[PDB]
């Protein structure tokens, strides 16, 4: 199953962001779990455009104040 | 009281087997926005990218190189 | 000069999120710098609605891998 790029928003199809990690060149990638069970990984810029509220939820679940 | 987002490192092969490396092939620079450039990616997404981060994407460095030549009048 | 609360998106009007802080009750608030140089403070919930890409930019600038 390919990610549906014909859809302007993925917010309603995505369950959560599972993790964000960093490539050697410094780019961030995100592994997402879809509501239908599938998983896919994207450059974070893709996630910013398709389901930013899911990645905000994920970051705020990991926030720490000094 | 500084804020930070603390993420446990995971091996990249937890992520990469499900990554389509073609999605963010840069197809063209569409317009400018302050220091950034609006780019079209192959997957069919447009986004604002920092000029000094275009080399993090397939074809981004090459696309920027040609754009800079046109912007500066060498092309 | 009051924030344009009726406008659906603030992305074009905001320079950056400067800080996110947590109030005693647990609420997160975001201090934002507008492109005109003014600063204002908002509940993060509002920022999620108005300029999610700006708060993403802030969070990704402060990611720490452990």
Residue numbers in the entry:
A (entry chain A), C (entry chain B): 315 to 380
B (entry chain C): 7 to 81
Copied sentences from the primary study:
Heterochromatin protein 1 (HP1) proteins are key factors of eukaryotic heterochromatin that coordinate chromatin compaction and transcriptional gene silencing. Through their multivalency they act as adaptors between histone H3 Lys9 di/trimethyl marks in chromatin and effector complexes that bind to the HP1 chromoshadow domain. In fission yeast, the two HP1 proteins Chp2 and Swi6 assume distinct roles and Chp2 is tightly associated with the nucleosome remodeling and deacetylation complex SHREC. Here we show that Chp2 binds the N terminus of Mit1, and that an extensive interface between Chp2 and Mit1 provides a high-affinity interaction that is required for recruitment of Mit1 to heterochromatin and silencing of gene expression.
This Mit1 fragment formed a stable complex with Chp2, which readily crystallized and allowed us to determine the structure by molecular replacement at a resolution of 1.6 Å. The structure of this minimal Chp2–Mit1 complex revealed a 2:1 stoichiometry with one Mit1 molecule bound to one Chp2CSD dimer. Mit1CII occupies the canonical peptide-binding groove at the CSD dimerization interface and, intriguingly, it wraps around one of the Chp2CSDs and engages an extensive interaction interface. The structure allows for the unambiguous identification of residues 9–13 of Mit1 in the CSD dimerization grove. These residues correspond to the sequence CKIVV with I11 occupying the center position on the symmetry axis of the CSD dimer. The central I11 is a large hydrophobic side chain, and when compared to HP1-CAF1, a canonical HP1-PxVxL complex, Chp2 accommodates the extra bulk of the isoleucine by a side chain rotation of Y373 such that the aromatic face of the tyrosine residue packs against the methyl groups of I11. The linker region is followed by a folded domain, easily recognizable as a CD fold with close resemblance to the Chp1 CD. However, the Mit1 CD-like (CDL) domain lacks an aromatic cage and the binding groove for a methyl-lysine histone peptide. The Chp2–Mit1 structure reveals an extensive interface that buries 3354 Å2 of surface area involving the CkIvV motif, linker region and CDL domain (CkIvV motif: 1465 Å2, Linker: 1131 Å2, CDL: 750 Å2). We also observe a molecule of hexanediol that is deeply buried by the Chp2 N terminus, and we speculate that it substitutes for one or two N-terminal residues by which our CSD construct is too short.
